């Protein structure tokens, strides 16, 4: 008769019951006020902002009248006001935000990770993590689709996983941004016209003109994966050590070691992305060579010949950009 | 001159900006103590929740070993110990939760709106405008592709939309069963498996075989449309009516109303359900009798033969699933 013990079980966990859902009341009170806060300190922060840019640009359209003697307290006005401008960065990098008008088009609810600072360091490292592992898969599934198969259905599956990929990459990093970074809004109309690309060759009518550019898409798309599996190394070893730069927990890092460590794997780095840029420039062009020849009439050759020329464009110019304020910054 | 203005703008700003960090800073322990309460919640329920399921299997297998005279207060006791697990879901219904092994490979952090109700009930209500703005565009676009085009481009274009409008859209509700539902995990294979079927019909290669059956395609999909516009009316005044329901202050809205209501609206939309349903089955078979013909040579026939049958097995068993419950509730 095992009864018993069930009982008291029952008032035990009575017992519990209401002691707990004392617990859950008190729980649902804190919650309300924090709420209150929470809308307080953004309609402030709100304010306080428009009325600094405001002043700001009177103090600026007035500037030119003045002379430079009494403009010197003028100068430190605005080297303090934009560091003010930072502080309220770092202020507002908590409070819940609103959504972007992309994230609204696909969601609509709020999410900001960042209430601390390691829910949000511990979030960039697993989107690392998963660029790696998808870049693992393509380019082995490329491999396959390259040199041993001849089919249509693979080539179709394998543009399917590209055009996947893509989109759920750039819904990842575009939670991230306004989390908080500077991602440098050419690098996901990147993703949109590589998406763009990818979905056109989908519908490739096959016939002679198809097999001329499979090799040179393939193998193209096997090299980029494979810049991506260095730049994955490259990438976490900066993030890891820029923590441990910011934590002086280990020891006193000094930011001379970081900044010639980093220099010298950039400087490494960058001869191979400027054999992937200048190959798919060299791509760009065999393909309206080949549009040229009389022998085609397929309007998916143009449209699949000018995404990989403005793709080349935006990345080789990004990519100096770059390099250049780098080496001002030194 | 108007410097003088705006230096003690600055001053009384920075008064503004000390008063505003205090507030910050008690706001950040504010939501450290929050936090902890949180952790303490759930692990508190999770223990709870298994040691109730525990005892209540020992005290199954131990039942039929007892006597009913005895037993009587064991029914009561599992009937109390259902409402116990639903009250159990009440309280966890605020309490940020885990997400779902399908999110988690999109995302990765924790988007809870249900903080409050209506937080939750302002965004049901959002997605259905987003699906009936969605079927607008497609029956539109569906009737230019059907009745005046006939090319390739724009029938990969309406296909496209598909494929996307599919996959936002399951994002959308697999959120909103976490947050709270009973959605019926059958409603979500649906859109894999219909995913699918727009996704072999975009690489088919046209010839003699495809304008056999583009016209029944597009004519469905107009349909199916069509059933989603009714739908939406149906759903939302459903909606709206169990809040003024719920919601006492308009009037003492009876159950007995609500339920004639709801009634007489689902009985009179049944007929269309079904004629669908047949519909998409004797498209199936038109389809495998197409593919029977030896004249034709493409896998794509049969792949998309199977996604119509399959999908019409499972709507047909599921619609009267509902209606036989929703009948015995009555
Ligand atoms: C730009 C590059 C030198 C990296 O340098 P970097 O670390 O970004 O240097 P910065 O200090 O300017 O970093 C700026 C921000 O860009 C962010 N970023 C996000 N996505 C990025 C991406 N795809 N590439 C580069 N930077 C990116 C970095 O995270 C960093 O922000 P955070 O560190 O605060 O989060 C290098 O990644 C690059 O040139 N990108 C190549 C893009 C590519 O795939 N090309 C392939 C051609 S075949
Ligand atoms: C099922 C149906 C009668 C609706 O009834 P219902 O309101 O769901 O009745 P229930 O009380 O069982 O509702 C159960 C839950 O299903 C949810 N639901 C979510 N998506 C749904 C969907 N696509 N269809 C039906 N119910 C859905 C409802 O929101 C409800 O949960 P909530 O009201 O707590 O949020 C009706 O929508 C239906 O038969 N669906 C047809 C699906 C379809 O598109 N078929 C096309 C064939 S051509």
């Avoid at 390691?118 to 491999?143: G, H, P, R, V």
């Avoid at 040199?147 to 394998?158: C, G, K, M, Q």
């Avoid at 080949?290 to 309007?299: H, R, S, T, V, Y």
Wanted: net charge positive; aromatic share 16%; proline share 2%.
């Amino acid at each position: 008769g095992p009864l018993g013990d069930c009982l008291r079980d029952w008032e035990d966990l009575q017992q519990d019951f209401q002691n707990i859902q004392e617990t859950h009341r008190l729980y649902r009170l804190k919650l309300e006020e924090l709420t209150k806060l929470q809308n307080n300190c953004t309609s402030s922060i709100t304010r306080q902002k428009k009325r600094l840019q405001e002043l700001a640009l009177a103090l600026k359209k007035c500037k030119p009248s003045l002379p430079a003697e009494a403009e010197g307290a003028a100068q430190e006005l605005e080297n303090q006001m934009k560091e003010r401008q930072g502080l309220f960065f770092d202020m507002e990098a908590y409070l819940p935000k609103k959504n972007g008008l992309y994230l609204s088009l696909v969601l609509g609810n709020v999410n900001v990770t960042l209430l601390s600072k390691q829910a949000k360091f511990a979030y960039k490292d697993e989107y690392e993590k998963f660029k790696l592992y998808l870049t693992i898969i393509l380019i082995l599934i490329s491999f396959t689709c390259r040199f041993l198969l001849n089919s249509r259905v693979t080539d179709a599956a394998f543009n399917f996983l590209l055009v996947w990929y893509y989109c759920t990459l750039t819904i990842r990093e575009s939670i991230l941004i306004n989390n908080g970074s500077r991602i440098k809004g050419w690098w996901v109309f990147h993703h949109y016209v590589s998406t763009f690309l990818s979905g056109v060759m989908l519908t490739w009518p096959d016939g002679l003109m198809y097999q001329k550019f499979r090799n040179q898409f393939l193998s193209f798309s096997m090299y980029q994966s494979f810049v991506q599996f260095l730049q994955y190394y490259y990438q976490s070893g900066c993030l890891y050590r820029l923590r441990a730069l910011g934590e002086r927990h280990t020891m006193d890092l000094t930011v001379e070691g970081f900044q010639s460590w980093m220099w010298r794997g950039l400087t490494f780095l960058l001869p191979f992305l400027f054999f992937g840029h200048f190959w798919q420039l060299f791509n760009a062009l065999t393909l309206f060579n080949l549009a040229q020849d009389p022998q085609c009439k397929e309007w998916q050759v143009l449209m699949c010949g000018f995404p990989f020329l403005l793709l080349f464009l935006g990345n080789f110019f990004t990519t100096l950009r770059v390099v250049h304020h780098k080496f001002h910054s030194q």
